[PDB]
PDB file of C-alpha atoms in Angstrom:
ATOM      1  CA  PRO R   1       0.000   0.000   0.000  1.00  0.00           C
ATOM      2  CA  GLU R   2       2.830   2.297  -1.091  1.00  0.00           C
ATOM      3  CA  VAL R   3       0.398   4.868  -2.522  1.00  0.00           C
ATOM      4  CA  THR R   4      -2.768   6.595  -1.283  1.00  0.00           C
ATOM      5  CA  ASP R   5      -5.783   5.852  -3.606  1.00  0.00           C
ATOM      6  CA  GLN R   6      -7.164   9.239  -4.707  1.00  0.00           C
ATOM      7  CA  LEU R   7     -10.172   8.421  -6.921  1.00  0.00           C
ATOM      8  CA  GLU R   8     -13.050  10.706  -5.922  1.00  0.00           C
ATOM      9  CA  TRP R   9     -15.477   7.973  -5.046  1.00  0.00           C
ATOM     10  CA  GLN R  10     -12.790   6.096  -2.880  1.00  0.00           C
ATOM     11  CA  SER R  11     -12.234   8.882  -0.328  1.00  0.00           C
ATOM     12  CA  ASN R  12     -13.944   6.788   2.494  1.00  0.00           C
ATOM     13  CA  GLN R  13     -12.094   3.619   1.526  1.00  0.00           C
ATOM     14  CA  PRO R  14      -9.098   3.887   3.786  1.00  0.00           C
ATOM     15  CA  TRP R  15     -11.098   4.177   7.036  1.00  0.00           C
ATOM     16  CA  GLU R  16     -13.649   1.660   5.996  1.00  0.00           C
ATOM     17  CA  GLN R  17     -10.969  -0.912   5.014  1.00  0.00           C
ATOM     18  CA  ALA R  18      -9.169  -0.348   8.334  1.00  0.00           C
ATOM     19  CA  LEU R  19     -12.550  -1.017   9.992  1.00  0.00           C
ATOM     20  CA  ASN R  20     -12.937  -4.165   7.922  1.00  0.00           C
ATOM     21  CA  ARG R  21      -9.573  -5.574   9.006  1.00  0.00           C
ATOM     22  CA  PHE R  22     -10.799  -4.988  12.599  1.00  0.00           C
ATOM     23  CA  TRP R  23     -14.039  -6.723  11.878  1.00  0.00           C
ATOM     24  CA  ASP R  24     -12.424  -9.746  10.157  1.00  0.00           C
ATOM     25  CA  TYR R  25      -9.973 -10.216  13.072  1.00  0.00           C
ATOM     26  CA  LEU R  26     -13.001 -10.052  15.417  1.00  0.00           C
ATOM     27  CA  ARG R  27     -15.030 -12.684  13.516  1.00  0.00           C
ATOM     28  CA  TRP R  28     -12.073 -15.001  13.923  1.00  0.00           C
ATOM     29  CA  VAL R  29     -11.913 -14.210  17.673  1.00  0.00           C
ATOM     30  CA  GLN R  30     -15.685 -14.789  17.962  1.00  0.00           C
ATOM     31  CA  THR R  31     -15.218 -18.581  17.251  1.00  0.00           C
ATOM     32  CA  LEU R  32     -13.185 -18.878  20.488  1.00  0.00           C
ATOM     33  CA  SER R  33     -11.565 -21.905  18.986  1.00  0.00           C
ATOM     34  CA  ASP R  34      -8.720 -23.684  20.758  1.00  0.00           C
ATOM     35  CA  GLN R  35      -6.182 -21.471  18.996  1.00  0.00           C
ATOM     36  CA  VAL R  36      -8.107 -18.228  19.766  1.00  0.00           C
ATOM     37  CA  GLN R  37      -8.143 -19.135  23.488  1.00  0.00           C
ATOM     38  CA  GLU R  38      -4.457 -19.649  23.755  1.00  0.00           C
ATOM     39  CA  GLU R  39      -3.609 -16.545  21.855  1.00  0.00           C
ATOM     40  CA  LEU R  40      -5.815 -14.467  24.079  1.00  0.00           C
ATOM     41  CA  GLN R  41      -3.859 -15.470  27.201  1.00  0.00           C
ATOM     42  CA  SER R  42      -0.668 -14.698  25.166  1.00  0.00           C
ATOM     43  CA  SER R  43      -1.748 -10.967  24.745  1.00  0.00           C
ATOM     44  CA  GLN R  44      -1.227 -11.122  20.953  1.00  0.00           C
ATOM     45  CA  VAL R  45      -4.991 -10.693  20.389  1.00  0.00           C
ATOM     46  CA  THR R  46      -5.550  -7.592  22.281  1.00  0.00           C
ATOM     47  CA  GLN R  47      -2.216  -6.062  21.061  1.00  0.00           C
ATOM     48  CA  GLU R  48      -3.224  -6.749  17.434  1.00  0.00           C
ATOM     49  CA  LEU R  49      -6.772  -5.602  18.008  1.00  0.00           C
ATOM     50  CA  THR R  50      -5.395  -2.523  19.470  1.00  0.00           C
ATOM     51  CA  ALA R  51      -3.194  -1.844  16.395  1.00  0.00           C
ATOM     52  CA  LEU R  52      -6.320  -2.269  14.203  1.00  0.00           C
ATOM     53  CA  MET R  53      -8.499  -0.040  16.180  1.00  0.00           C
ATOM     54  CA  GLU R  54      -5.941   2.666  16.265  1.00  0.00           C
ATOM     55  CA  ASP R  55      -5.378   2.564  12.523  1.00  0.00           C
ATOM     56  CA  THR R  56      -9.119   2.838  12.016  1.00  0.00           C
ATOM     57  CA  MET R  57      -9.221   5.980  14.153  1.00  0.00           C
ATOM     58  CA  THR R  58      -6.236   7.494  12.373  1.00  0.00           C
ATOM     59  CA  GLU R  59      -7.970   6.988   8.974  1.00  0.00           C
ATOM     60  CA  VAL R  60     -11.295   8.386  10.307  1.00  0.00           C
ATOM     61  CA  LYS R  61      -9.422  11.544  11.524  1.00  0.00           C
ATOM     62  CA  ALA R  62      -7.510  11.960   8.261  1.00  0.00           C
ATOM     63  CA  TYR R  63     -10.820  11.640   6.396  1.00  0.00           C
ATOM     64  CA  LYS R  64     -12.750  14.183   8.513  1.00  0.00           C
ATOM     65  CA  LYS R  65      -9.940  16.722   8.084  1.00  0.00           C
ATOM     66  CA  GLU R  66      -9.915  16.059   4.391  1.00  0.00           C
ATOM     67  CA  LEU R  67     -13.723  16.645   4.096  1.00  0.00           C
ATOM     68  CA  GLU R  68     -13.523  19.772   6.180  1.00  0.00           C
ATOM     69  CA  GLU R  69     -10.786  21.160   3.931  1.00  0.00           C
ATOM     70  CA  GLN R  70     -12.786  20.457   0.755  1.00  0.00           C
ATOM     71  CA  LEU R  71     -16.026  21.880   2.178  1.00  0.00           C
ATOM     72  CA  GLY R  72     -17.724  25.196   1.502  1.00  0.00           C
ATOM     73  CA  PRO R  73     -18.780  27.751   0.730  1.00  0.00           C
ATOM     74  CA  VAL R  74     -20.928  26.994   3.693  1.00  0.00           C
ATOM     75  CA  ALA R  75     -22.169  28.703   6.837  1.00  0.00           C
ATOM     76  CA  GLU R  76     -19.747  28.446   9.806  1.00  0.00           C
ATOM     77  CA  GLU R  77     -22.613  27.289  11.999  1.00  0.00           C
ATOM     78  CA  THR R  78     -23.341  24.280   9.808  1.00  0.00           C
ATOM     79  CA  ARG R  79     -19.694  23.179   9.436  1.00  0.00           C
ATOM     80  CA  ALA R  80     -19.489  23.360  13.174  1.00  0.00           C
ATOM     81  CA  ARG R  81     -22.593  21.077  13.515  1.00  0.00           C
ATOM     82  CA  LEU R  82     -21.706  18.662  10.783  1.00  0.00           C
ATOM     83  CA  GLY R  83     -18.237  18.361  12.493  1.00  0.00           C
ATOM     84  CA  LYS R  84     -20.032  17.990  15.986  1.00  0.00           C
ATOM     85  CA  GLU R  85     -21.896  15.011  14.573  1.00  0.00           C
ATOM     86  CA  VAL R  86     -19.042  13.273  12.844  1.00  0.00           C
ATOM     87  CA  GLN R  87     -17.071  13.620  16.143  1.00  0.00           C
ATOM     88  CA  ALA R  88     -19.883  12.136  18.164  1.00  0.00           C
ATOM     89  CA  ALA R  89     -20.283   9.228  15.772  1.00  0.00           C
ATOM     90  CA  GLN R  90     -16.529   8.625  15.734  1.00  0.00           C
ATOM     91  CA  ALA R  91     -16.481   8.573  19.453  1.00  0.00           C
ATOM     92  CA  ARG R  92     -19.221   6.019  19.599  1.00  0.00           C
ATOM     93  CA  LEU R  93     -17.257   3.856  17.301  1.00  0.00           C
ATOM     94  CA  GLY R  94     -14.105   4.117  19.378  1.00  0.00           C
ATOM     95  CA  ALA R  95     -16.109   3.441  22.521  1.00  0.00           C
ATOM     96  CA  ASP R  96     -17.498   0.260  20.980  1.00  0.00           C
ATOM     97  CA  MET R  97     -13.946  -0.931  19.939  1.00  0.00           C
ATOM     98  CA  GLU R  98     -12.697  -0.212  23.439  1.00  0.00           C
ATOM     99  CA  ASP R  99     -15.495  -2.213  24.923  1.00  0.00           C
ATOM    100  CA  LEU R 100     -14.548  -5.142  22.694  1.00  0.00           C
ATOM    101  CA  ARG R 101     -10.835  -5.004  23.549  1.00  0.00           C
ATOM    102  CA  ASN R 102     -11.659  -4.459  27.189  1.00  0.00           C
ATOM    103  CA  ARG R 103     -14.140  -7.397  27.377  1.00  0.00           C
ATOM    104  CA  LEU R 104     -11.355  -9.524  25.939  1.00  0.00           C
ATOM    105  CA  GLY R 105      -8.965  -8.210  28.621  1.00  0.00           C
ATOM    106  CA  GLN R 106     -11.554  -9.062  31.305  1.00  0.00           C
ATOM    107  CA  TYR R 107     -11.742 -12.543  29.921  1.00  0.00           C
ATOM    108  CA  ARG R 108      -7.934 -12.872  29.947  1.00  0.00           C
ATOM    109  CA  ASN R 109      -7.908 -11.605  33.530  1.00  0.00           C
ATOM    110  CA  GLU R 110     -10.658 -14.076  34.671  1.00  0.00           C
ATOM    111  CA  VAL R 111      -8.570 -16.879  33.117  1.00  0.00           C
ATOM    112  CA  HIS R 112      -5.402 -15.665  34.983  1.00  0.00           C
ATOM    113  CA  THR R 113      -7.427 -15.834  38.213  1.00  0.00           C
ATOM    114  CA  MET R 114      -7.983 -19.530  37.339  1.00  0.00           C
ATOM    115  CA  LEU R 115      -4.286 -19.984  36.537  1.00  0.00           C
ATOM    116  CA  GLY R 116      -4.825 -20.420  32.869  1.00  0.00           C
ATOM    117  CA  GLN R 117      -7.968 -22.593  33.044  1.00  0.00           C
ATOM    118  CA  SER R 118     -11.082 -21.522  31.062  1.00  0.00           C
ATOM    119  CA  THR R 119     -14.553 -22.857  31.523  1.00  0.00           C
ATOM    120  CA  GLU R 120     -17.609 -23.260  29.396  1.00  0.00           C
ATOM    121  CA  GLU R 121     -19.455 -20.819  31.438  1.00  0.00           C
ATOM    122  CA  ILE R 122     -17.072 -17.902  31.003  1.00  0.00           C
ATOM    123  CA  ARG R 123     -16.434 -18.696  27.293  1.00  0.00           C
ATOM    124  CA  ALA R 124     -20.129 -18.692  26.685  1.00  0.00           C
ATOM    125  CA  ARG R 125     -20.597 -15.325  28.360  1.00  0.00           C
ATOM    126  CA  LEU R 126     -17.643 -13.932  26.370  1.00  0.00           C
ATOM    127  CA  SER R 127     -19.086 -15.432  23.157  1.00  0.00           C
ATOM    128  CA  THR R 128     -22.467 -13.899  23.799  1.00  0.00           C
ATOM    129  CA  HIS R 129     -21.102 -10.539  24.759  1.00  0.00           C
ATOM    130  CA  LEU R 130     -18.768 -10.297  21.727  1.00  0.00           C
ATOM    131  CA  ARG R 131     -21.627 -10.943  19.372  1.00  0.00           C
ATOM    132  CA  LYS R 132     -23.713  -8.237  20.826  1.00  0.00           C
ATOM    133  CA  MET R 133     -20.871  -5.695  20.752  1.00  0.00           C
ATOM    134  CA  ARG R 134     -19.956  -6.702  17.176  1.00  0.00           C
ATOM    135  CA  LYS R 135     -23.519  -5.910  16.106  1.00  0.00           C
ATOM    136  CA  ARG R 136     -23.440  -2.590  18.035  1.00  0.00           C
ATOM    137  CA  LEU R 137     -20.166  -1.800  16.231  1.00  0.00           C
ATOM    138  CA  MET R 138     -21.748  -2.389  12.826  1.00  0.00           C
ATOM    139  CA  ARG R 139     -24.592  -0.031  13.633  1.00  0.00           C
ATOM    140  CA  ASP R 140     -22.214   2.655  14.827  1.00  0.00           C
ATOM    141  CA  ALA R 141     -19.926   2.331  11.922  1.00  0.00           C
ATOM    142  CA  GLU R 142     -22.940   2.693   9.559  1.00  0.00           C
ATOM    143  CA  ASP R 143     -23.892   5.748  11.491  1.00  0.00           C
ATOM    144  CA  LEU R 144     -20.396   7.164  11.138  1.00  0.00           C
ATOM    145  CA  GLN R 145     -20.404   6.505   7.368  1.00  0.00           C
ATOM    146  CA  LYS R 146     -23.724   8.399   7.168  1.00  0.00           C
ATOM    147  CA  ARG R 147     -22.363  11.394   9.208  1.00  0.00           C
ATOM    148  CA  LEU R 148     -19.363  11.588   6.911  1.00  0.00           C
ATOM    149  CA  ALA R 149     -21.557  11.420   3.726  1.00  0.00           C
ATOM    150  CA  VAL R 150     -23.659  14.267   4.950  1.00  0.00           C
ATOM    151  CA  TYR R 151     -20.471  16.226   5.613  1.00  0.00           C
ATOM    152  CA  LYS R 152     -19.144  15.594   2.110  1.00  0.00           C
ATOM    153  CA  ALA R 153     -20.907  18.639   0.714  1.00  0.00           C
ATOM    154  CA  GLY R 154     -20.295  22.384   0.814  1.00  0.00           C
ATOM    155  CA  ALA R 155     -20.353  23.757  -2.730  1.00  0.00           C
ATOM    156  CA  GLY R 156     -17.366  22.672  -9.830  1.00  0.00           C
ATOM    157  CA  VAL R 157     -17.593  22.472 -13.632  1.00  0.00           C
ATOM    158  CA  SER R 158     -16.713  26.208 -13.450  1.00  0.00           C
ATOM    159  CA  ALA R 159     -13.405  25.447 -11.691  1.00  0.00           C
ATOM    160  CA  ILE R 160     -12.557  22.743 -14.239  1.00  0.00           C
ATOM    161  CA  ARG R 161     -13.319  25.123 -17.119  1.00  0.00           C
ATOM    162  CA  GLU R 162     -11.187  27.863 -15.588  1.00  0.00           C
ATOM    163  CA  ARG R 163      -8.275  25.282 -15.580  1.00  0.00           C
ATOM    164  CA  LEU R 164      -8.912  24.135 -19.210  1.00  0.00           C
ATOM    165  CA  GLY R 165      -9.394  27.499 -20.846  1.00  0.00           C
ATOM    166  CA  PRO R 166      -9.356  28.987 -23.337  1.00  0.00           C
ATOM    167  CA  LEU R 167      -9.303  31.675 -20.563  1.00  0.00           C
ATOM    168  CA  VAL R 168      -9.869  35.370 -21.109  1.00  0.00           C
TER     169      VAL R 168
END
């Protein structure tokens, strides 16, 4: 990924793809297979989840700043509100990712309290809770995508023509 994709319709692609890597990793975790379980005690899962969450947030932030720079003419008041809303939606998304990572840390800690033994009971509660948070994350990510779409706005053929000329 040595270059940043710059096609006009692909401006949301970097954050959404970062989000997708997060979601794929999570669907793997959700199986709670014998290999997932070990790797969760080994702190690889939460470290990797954490790298994926962070990269999502970095691409959401780059994208919001890019939209805000390509916005307008627009009333200050409305840029302020459209920004307000993106920020709020972003935050919900981060909160949901934190809850995931943190639930997985709680599970690792409960297993440490049992000296590396897991039970069916606590695996089943983890399983159930992950699914519910995964679904909440989808909803909030869809909400963030909608907030960003609204923001992509502001003001085009005129500008292009003034580059092409003939200009007098």
